[PDB]
Design an enzyme around this catalytic site. Structure first.
Site, mmCIF file in Angstrom:
data_model
loop_
_atom_site.group_PDB
_atom_site.id
_atom_site.type_symbol
_atom_site.label_atom_id
_atom_site.label_comp_id
_atom_site.label_asym_id
_atom_site.label_seq_id
_atom_site.Cartn_x
_atom_site.Cartn_y
_atom_site.Cartn_z
ATOM 1 N N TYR A 1 54.199 48.413 36.148
ATOM 2 C CA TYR A 1 55.492 47.838 36.596
ATOM 3 C C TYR A 1 55.343 46.324 36.695
ATOM 4 O O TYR A 1 54.349 45.888 37.278
ATOM 5 C CB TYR A 1 55.817 48.433 37.957
ATOM 6 C CG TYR A 1 57.239 48.311 38.435
ATOM 7 C CD1 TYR A 1 58.195 49.209 38.007
ATOM 8 C CD2 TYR A 1 57.560 47.471 39.485
ATOM 9 C CE1 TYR A 1 59.470 49.226 38.558
ATOM 10 C CE2 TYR A 1 58.832 47.464 40.045
ATOM 11 C CZ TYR A 1 59.795 48.342 39.579
ATOM 12 O OH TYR A 1 61.058 48.355 40.121
ATOM 13 N N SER B 1 48.342 52.011 35.987
ATOM 14 C CA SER B 1 49.238 52.253 37.140
ATOM 15 C C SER B 1 50.373 53.172 36.654
ATOM 16 O O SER B 1 50.061 54.284 36.241
ATOM 17 C CB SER B 1 49.696 50.925 37.761
ATOM 18 O OG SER B 1 50.142 51.109 39.088
ATOM 19 N N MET B 2 51.629 52.746 36.671
ATOM 20 C CA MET B 2 52.725 53.614 36.180
ATOM 21 C C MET B 2 52.513 53.963 34.710
ATOM 22 O O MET B 2 52.929 55.063 34.330
ATOM 23 C CB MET B 2 54.081 52.942 36.337
ATOM 24 C CG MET B 2 54.670 53.145 37.715
ATOM 25 S SD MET B 2 56.298 52.385 37.700
ATOM 26 C CE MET B 2 56.625 52.441 39.461
ATOM 27 N N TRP C 1 49.301 55.829 38.784
ATOM 28 C CA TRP C 1 50.249 56.178 39.861
ATOM 29 C C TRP C 1 51.387 57.011 39.275
ATOM 30 O O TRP C 1 51.857 56.670 38.187
ATOM 31 C CB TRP C 1 50.821 54.982 40.605
ATOM 32 C CG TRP C 1 51.774 55.472 41.654
ATOM 33 C CD1 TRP C 1 51.455 55.894 42.911
ATOM 34 C CD2 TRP C 1 53.193 55.681 41.511
ATOM 35 N NE1 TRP C 1 52.576 56.322 43.569
ATOM 36 C CE2 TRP C 1 53.655 56.210 42.733
ATOM 37 C CE3 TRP C 1 54.112 55.474 40.476
ATOM 38 C CZ2 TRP C 1 54.997 56.521 42.944
ATOM 39 C CZ3 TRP C 1 55.434 55.791 40.682
ATOM 40 C CH2 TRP C 1 55.869 56.301 41.903
ATOM 41 N N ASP D 1 42.091 49.337 45.909
ATOM 42 C CA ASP D 1 43.493 49.350 45.411
ATOM 43 C C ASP D 1 44.440 49.489 46.619
ATOM 44 O O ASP D 1 44.321 50.466 47.364
ATOM 45 C CB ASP D 1 43.670 50.502 44.413
ATOM 46 C CG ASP D 1 44.866 50.337 43.503
ATOM 47 O OD1 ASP D 1 45.880 49.799 43.993
ATOM 48 O OD2 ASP D 1 44.750 50.676 42.291
ATOM 49 N N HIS E 1 43.685 46.435 42.445
ATOM 50 C CA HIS E 1 44.531 47.241 41.533
ATOM 51 C C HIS E 1 44.303 46.848 40.062
ATOM 52 O O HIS E 1 44.509 47.704 39.194
ATOM 53 C CB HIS E 1 45.974 47.081 41.964
ATOM 54 C CG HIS E 1 46.914 47.953 41.216
ATOM 55 N ND1 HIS E 1 46.742 49.320 41.154
ATOM 56 C CD2 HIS E 1 48.059 47.653 40.565
ATOM 57 C CE1 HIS E 1 47.752 49.834 40.466
ATOM 58 N NE2 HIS E 1 48.573 48.822 40.075
#
Length: 261
Positions: free
Chosen positions: A58, A131-132, A156, A177, A208
Protein backbone atom coordinates in the site's frame (compact mmCIF):
# COMPACT_ATOMS: atom_id res chain seq x y z
CA UNK A 1 16.06 -32.35 -15.16
CA UNK A 2 15.07 -30.36 -18.29
CA UNK A 3 14.55 -27.17 -16.15
CA UNK A 4 18.05 -27.13 -14.54
CA UNK A 5 19.93 -23.92 -15.49
CA UNK A 6 23.38 -22.52 -14.61
CA UNK A 7 26.34 -24.00 -12.72
CA UNK A 8 26.15 -25.92 -9.42
CA UNK A 9 25.29 -23.37 -6.70
CA UNK A 10 27.49 -22.40 -3.73
CA UNK A 11 26.78 -20.31 -0.58
CA UNK A 12 29.05 -17.61 -2.21
CA UNK A 13 27.37 -17.78 -5.67
CA UNK A 14 23.90 -17.36 -3.99
CA UNK A 15 25.02 -14.59 -1.53
CA UNK A 16 26.58 -12.49 -4.39
CA UNK A 17 24.73 -9.41 -5.77
CA UNK A 18 24.60 -11.09 -9.22
CA UNK A 19 24.01 -14.69 -10.37
CA UNK A 20 25.67 -16.22 -13.47
CA UNK A 21 23.39 -14.70 -16.18
CA UNK A 22 23.51 -11.24 -17.80
CA UNK A 23 20.28 -9.26 -17.17
CA UNK A 24 18.46 -6.79 -19.47
CA UNK A 25 15.12 -5.07 -18.79
CA UNK A 26 12.29 -3.26 -20.59
CA UNK A 27 9.21 -1.25 -19.60
CA UNK A 28 5.89 -2.92 -20.58
CA UNK A 29 4.53 -0.65 -23.37
CA UNK A 30 0.83 -1.40 -22.74
CA UNK A 31 0.20 -2.93 -19.28
CA UNK A 32 -2.81 -5.32 -19.47
CA UNK A 33 -4.77 -5.23 -16.18
CA UNK A 34 -2.24 -3.40 -13.91
CA UNK A 35 -0.61 0.08 -13.67
CA UNK A 36 2.94 -0.36 -15.01
CA UNK A 37 5.59 -3.07 -15.28
CA UNK A 38 9.29 -3.69 -15.71
CA UNK A 39 10.46 -7.06 -17.11
CA UNK A 40 13.95 -8.38 -16.18
CA UNK A 41 15.32 -11.33 -18.17
CA UNK A 42 18.53 -13.34 -18.56
CA UNK A 43 20.16 -12.90 -22.00
CA UNK A 44 22.15 -16.19 -21.81
CA UNK A 45 20.21 -18.73 -19.61
CA UNK A 46 20.69 -21.47 -22.25
CA UNK A 47 17.04 -22.62 -22.08
CA UNK A 48 13.48 -21.42 -21.30
CA UNK A 49 13.00 -20.14 -17.74
CA UNK A 50 10.05 -19.69 -15.42
CA UNK A 51 8.35 -16.35 -14.70
CA UNK A 52 7.86 -14.49 -11.38
CA UNK A 53 5.48 -11.54 -10.74
CA UNK A 54 6.27 -9.16 -7.87
CA UNK A 55 3.76 -6.70 -6.34
CA UNK A 56 4.48 -3.86 -3.84
CA UNK A 57 2.57 -2.78 -0.68
CA UNK A 58 0.00 0.00 0.00
CA UNK A 59 1.38 3.42 -1.16
CA UNK A 60 4.42 1.65 -2.67
CA UNK A 61 5.74 1.35 -6.24
CA UNK A 62 8.24 -0.84 -8.14
CA UNK A 63 11.19 0.90 -6.36
CA UNK A 64 10.30 -0.97 -3.08
CA UNK A 65 10.70 -4.47 -4.70
CA UNK A 66 12.87 -3.73 -7.77
CA UNK A 67 16.11 -5.26 -6.29
CA UNK A 68 14.48 -8.73 -6.75
CA UNK A 69 14.32 -8.12 -10.53
CA UNK A 70 18.01 -8.39 -11.42
CA UNK A 71 18.73 -10.67 -8.38
CA UNK A 72 16.27 -13.40 -9.57
CA UNK A 73 16.74 -12.82 -13.35
CA UNK A 74 20.56 -13.25 -12.96
CA UNK A 75 19.91 -16.85 -11.70
CA UNK A 76 17.56 -17.75 -14.65
CA UNK A 77 14.02 -16.26 -14.27
CA UNK A 78 11.89 -13.72 -16.16
CA UNK A 79 10.75 -11.31 -13.41
CA UNK A 80 7.97 -8.69 -13.81
CA UNK A 81 7.76 -5.98 -11.12
CA UNK A 82 4.49 -4.03 -11.22
CA UNK A 83 2.87 -0.82 -10.12
CA UNK A 84 -0.81 -1.33 -9.26
CA UNK A 85 -3.68 0.56 -10.95
CA UNK A 86 -3.86 2.47 -7.58
CA UNK A 87 -1.23 2.69 -4.79
CA UNK A 88 -4.33 2.14 -2.54
CA UNK A 89 -5.45 -1.23 -4.04
CA UNK A 90 -6.26 -4.04 -1.50
CA UNK A 91 -4.81 -7.63 -1.55
CA UNK A 92 -7.59 -9.25 -3.71
CA UNK A 93 -7.01 -6.55 -6.38
CA UNK A 94 -3.18 -6.94 -6.02
CA UNK A 95 -3.66 -10.71 -6.65
CA UNK A 96 -5.74 -10.04 -9.84
CA UNK A 97 -3.04 -7.57 -11.05
CA UNK A 98 -0.16 -10.03 -10.24
CA UNK A 99 -1.89 -12.80 -12.26
CA UNK A 100 -2.57 -10.25 -15.08
CA UNK A 101 1.22 -9.49 -15.08
CA UNK A 102 2.00 -13.24 -15.44
CA UNK A 103 -0.59 -13.47 -18.28
CA UNK A 104 1.16 -10.58 -20.07
CA UNK A 105 4.59 -12.27 -19.69
CA UNK A 106 2.99 -15.29 -21.42
CA UNK A 107 1.69 -12.96 -24.18
CA UNK A 108 5.15 -11.35 -24.64
CA UNK A 109 6.72 -14.86 -24.81
CA UNK A 110 4.57 -15.37 -28.00
CA UNK A 111 5.20 -11.81 -29.37
CA UNK A 112 8.03 -11.81 -32.01
CA UNK A 113 8.96 -8.10 -31.27
CA UNK A 114 9.45 -8.75 -27.49
CA UNK A 115 12.95 -9.24 -26.01
CA UNK A 116 11.51 -12.32 -24.11
CA UNK A 117 10.10 -13.98 -27.30
CA UNK A 118 10.44 -17.77 -26.68
CA UNK A 119 12.42 -17.25 -23.42
CA UNK A 120 9.63 -18.28 -20.97
CA UNK A 121 8.31 -21.70 -19.93
CA UNK A 122 4.74 -20.42 -19.31
CA UNK A 123 3.99 -23.65 -17.36
CA UNK A 124 6.39 -22.64 -14.50
CA UNK A 125 5.36 -19.48 -12.63
CA UNK A 126 5.95 -17.89 -9.21
CA UNK A 127 4.54 -15.03 -7.07
CA UNK A 128 6.19 -12.63 -4.63
CA UNK A 129 5.32 -9.30 -3.02
CA UNK A 130 5.44 -7.03 -0.02
CA UNK A 131 2.79 -6.61 2.73
CA UNK A 132 -0.61 -6.32 0.93
CA UNK A 133 1.29 -7.52 -2.21
CA UNK A 134 2.38 -10.50 -0.06
CA UNK A 135 -1.23 -11.18 0.93
CA UNK A 136 -2.03 -10.89 -2.79
CA UNK A 137 0.73 -13.49 -3.55
CA UNK A 138 -0.93 -15.95 -1.12
CA UNK A 139 -4.42 -15.26 -2.62
CA UNK A 140 -2.80 -15.89 -6.06
CA UNK A 141 -1.36 -19.23 -4.78
CA UNK A 142 -4.72 -20.27 -3.12
CA UNK A 143 -6.66 -19.51 -6.38
CA UNK A 144 -4.00 -20.98 -8.78
CA UNK A 145 -2.48 -24.17 -7.32
CA UNK A 146 -0.52 -24.83 -10.59
CA UNK A 147 1.77 -21.94 -9.47
CA UNK A 148 5.14 -23.55 -8.60
CA UNK A 149 6.27 -21.29 -5.70
CA UNK A 150 5.32 -18.26 -3.56
CA UNK A 151 7.76 -16.11 -1.56
CA UNK A 152 5.86 -13.17 0.01
CA UNK A 153 7.63 -10.67 2.35
CA UNK A 154 6.11 -9.17 5.53
CA UNK A 155 2.69 -10.32 4.30
CA UNK A 156 -0.64 -8.85 5.38
CA UNK A 157 -4.22 -9.90 4.59
CA UNK A 158 -7.57 -9.37 6.41
CA UNK A 159 -7.55 -13.19 6.71
CA UNK A 160 -4.65 -15.23 8.18
CA UNK A 161 -6.33 -18.51 7.05
CA UNK A 162 -4.33 -19.69 3.97
CA UNK A 163 -5.07 -23.35 4.86
CA UNK A 164 -6.13 -23.68 1.10
CA UNK A 165 -2.51 -23.05 -0.19
CA UNK A 166 -0.79 -26.17 -1.68
CA UNK A 167 1.97 -24.13 -3.40
CA UNK A 168 5.50 -24.22 -1.82
CA UNK A 169 5.54 -20.99 0.24
CA UNK A 170 8.48 -19.13 1.82
CA UNK A 171 7.38 -16.31 4.17
CA UNK A 172 9.93 -13.56 4.83
CA UNK A 173 9.09 -11.70 8.05
CA UNK A 174 10.59 -8.64 9.82
CA UNK A 175 11.06 -9.14 13.63
CA UNK A 176 10.10 -5.56 14.72
CA UNK A 177 7.39 -5.01 12.01
CA UNK A 178 4.91 -2.43 13.48
CA UNK A 179 2.78 -2.24 10.26
CA UNK A 180 2.03 -6.00 9.99
CA UNK A 181 3.19 -7.45 13.35
CA UNK A 182 4.63 -10.97 12.87
CA UNK A 183 2.45 -12.33 15.75
CA UNK A 184 -0.79 -11.07 14.09
CA UNK A 185 0.15 -11.51 10.37
CA UNK A 186 3.21 -13.45 9.09
CA UNK A 187 3.29 -16.19 11.80
CA UNK A 188 -0.48 -16.98 11.87
CA UNK A 189 -0.44 -17.11 8.01
CA UNK A 190 2.53 -19.56 8.16
CA UNK A 191 0.84 -21.69 10.87
CA UNK A 192 -2.45 -21.88 8.85
CA UNK A 193 -0.77 -23.78 5.93
CA UNK A 194 -0.80 -27.61 6.53
CA UNK A 195 -0.80 -28.99 2.92
CA UNK A 196 2.46 -27.54 1.50
CA UNK A 197 6.24 -27.28 1.62
CA UNK A 198 6.65 -24.09 3.68
CA UNK A 199 9.27 -21.97 5.42
CA UNK A 200 9.29 -18.97 7.77
CA UNK A 201 12.33 -16.70 7.87
CA UNK A 202 12.16 -13.71 10.30
CA UNK A 203 14.91 -11.04 9.89
CA UNK A 204 16.38 -9.98 13.30
CA UNK A 205 15.70 -6.31 14.23
CA UNK A 206 13.84 -5.87 10.91
CA UNK A 207 11.34 -3.04 10.25
CA UNK A 208 8.41 -3.60 7.82
CA UNK A 209 10.78 -2.82 4.85
CA UNK A 210 13.50 -5.41 5.91
CA UNK A 211 13.21 -7.31 2.52
CA UNK A 212 12.83 -4.19 0.28
CA UNK A 213 15.30 -2.53 -2.13
CA UNK A 214 18.23 -1.12 -0.06
CA UNK A 215 17.87 -3.69 2.76
CA UNK A 216 21.10 -4.70 4.64
CA UNK A 217 20.41 -8.48 4.31
CA UNK A 218 20.50 -8.92 0.50
CA UNK A 219 23.11 -11.75 0.85
CA UNK A 220 20.84 -13.94 3.08
CA UNK A 221 17.39 -12.83 1.73
CA UNK A 222 18.63 -13.12 -1.90
CA UNK A 223 20.16 -16.55 -1.25
CA UNK A 224 16.92 -17.88 0.32
CA UNK A 225 14.62 -16.31 -2.34
CA UNK A 226 16.70 -17.65 -5.25
CA UNK A 227 17.15 -21.12 -3.67
CA UNK A 228 13.39 -21.43 -2.96
CA UNK A 229 12.41 -20.42 -6.54
CA UNK A 230 15.16 -22.69 -8.04
CA UNK A 231 14.14 -25.69 -5.91
CA UNK A 232 10.37 -25.42 -6.56
CA UNK A 233 10.00 -23.62 -9.94
CA UNK A 234 12.84 -25.63 -11.67
CA UNK A 235 12.44 -28.82 -9.48
CA UNK A 236 16.21 -28.31 -9.03
CA UNK A 237 17.30 -30.52 -6.09
CA UNK A 238 20.82 -29.02 -6.41
CA UNK A 239 19.10 -26.23 -4.37
CA UNK A 240 17.42 -28.55 -1.78
CA UNK A 241 19.97 -27.88 1.04
CA UNK A 242 19.93 -24.06 0.45
CA UNK A 243 16.09 -24.07 0.22
CA UNK A 244 15.35 -26.25 3.31
CA UNK A 245 18.25 -25.39 5.70
CA UNK A 246 18.06 -23.31 8.89
CA UNK A 247 20.64 -20.60 8.02
CA UNK A 248 21.91 -20.69 11.67
CA UNK A 249 22.59 -16.90 11.31
CA UNK A 250 22.54 -14.00 13.84
CA UNK A 251 20.59 -12.12 11.12
CA UNK A 252 17.63 -14.56 11.69
CA UNK A 253 15.41 -14.11 14.83
CA UNK A 254 12.95 -16.96 13.99
CA UNK A 255 13.09 -19.92 11.56
CA UNK A 256 10.43 -22.57 10.86
CA UNK A 257 10.11 -25.13 8.01
CA UNK A 258 7.87 -28.08 7.09
CA UNK A 259 7.45 -30.65 4.24
CA UNK A 260 10.68 -29.31 2.63
CA UNK A 261 12.87 -31.67 0.49
Amino acid sequence: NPYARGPNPTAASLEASAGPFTVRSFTVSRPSGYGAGTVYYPTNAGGTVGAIAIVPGYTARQSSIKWWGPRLASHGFVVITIDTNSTLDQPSSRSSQQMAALRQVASLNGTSSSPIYGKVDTARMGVMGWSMGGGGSLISAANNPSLKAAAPQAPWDSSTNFSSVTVPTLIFACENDSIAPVNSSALPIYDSMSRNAKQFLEIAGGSHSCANSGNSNQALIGKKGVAWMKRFMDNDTRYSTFACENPNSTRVSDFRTANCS
